[PDB]
DNA sequence: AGCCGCGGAACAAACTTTTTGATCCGCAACCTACTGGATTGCGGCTCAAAAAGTTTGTTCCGCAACTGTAAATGTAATC
């Protein structure tokens, strides 16, 4: 129902974004606008504000507190996924090192069974965002290391 | 989505602390010796009167967490 209530808004905003070389996406309420041209996002913000108050009405409004700008100069994220300056999709250095530290500690056998499920979930999740990271772990630590958590007993 | 008591506020009559515009009264001046008229004039001191400065009793304004039959759910992450 949350999707059906916002269907014409999405179509019109996509049509507007197509003409200005702007990419559109939306997860429930996480509307992210991205572009390659410089100083065009103001027009996109004005358009989304004026179309959110015309079809769907004055019912919902733009949170004028969390409107955030970003570029390659600073950190850029789209729903948990970190976009690198080299045009790559990764989790982020902190998580990237946390997972590898945990999988390394697995080999030394100094980890309790509580966090074994933590590593199971984290390795399983590092297949839906970055399909590569586990391959890099295999390249560094080995297949024998990875194929012990995914089928842990 | 509704609106509890609490405490500032926006107003508005009363007190209350000075700004102003005369009036006065020593008080040295004349004038000549000295109360010189039958005089003025001049600067501190005081007077309510009233345009300014608080002080205090009343009236609305706003806002929070959750509501009456009602989910413990192996791991990670999204709105």
Swiss-Prot record:
Mg(2+) binds at residues 29-30. It comes from the Bacteria. Belongs to the bacterial reverse transcriptase family. Reverse transcriptase (RT) component of antiviral defense system retron Ec83, composed of a non-coding RNA (ncRNA), this reverse transcriptase (RT), a probable ATPase and a putative HNH endonuclease. Expression of retron Ec83 confers protection against bacteriophages T2, T4 and T6. At multiplicity of infection (MOI) of 0.02 cultures slow growth when infected with T4 but do not collapse, at MOI 2 cultures enter growth stasis. Responsible for synthesis of msDNA-Ec83 (a linear ssDNA with a 5'-terminal phosphate residue). This is Retron Ec83 reverse transcriptase. It comes from Escherichia coli. The chain holds residues 157 to 309 of 312 of the full protein.
């Amino acid at each position: 129902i949350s999707n059906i209530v916002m269907s014409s808004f999405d179509e019109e905003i996509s049509s507007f974004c197509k003409e200005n070389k702007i990419s559109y996406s939306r997860y429930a309420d996480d509307l992210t606008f991205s572009t390659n041209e410089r100083d065009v996002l103001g027009l996109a913000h004005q358009k989304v504000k004026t179309t959110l108050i015309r079809f769907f009405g004055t019912r919902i409004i733009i949170n004028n507190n969390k409107i955030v700008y970003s570029s390659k100069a600073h950190n850029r994220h789209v729903t948990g996924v970190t976009l690198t300056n080299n045009n790559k999709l990764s989790l982020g250095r902190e998580r990237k090192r946390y997972i590898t530290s945990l999988v390394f500690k697995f080999k030394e056998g100094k980890l309790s069974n509580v966090d074994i499920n933590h590593l199971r979930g984290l390795i399983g999740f590092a297949y839906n965002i970055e399909p590569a990271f586990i391959e890099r772990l295999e390249k560094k630590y080995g297949e024998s290391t990875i194929k012990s958590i995914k089928k842990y007993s």
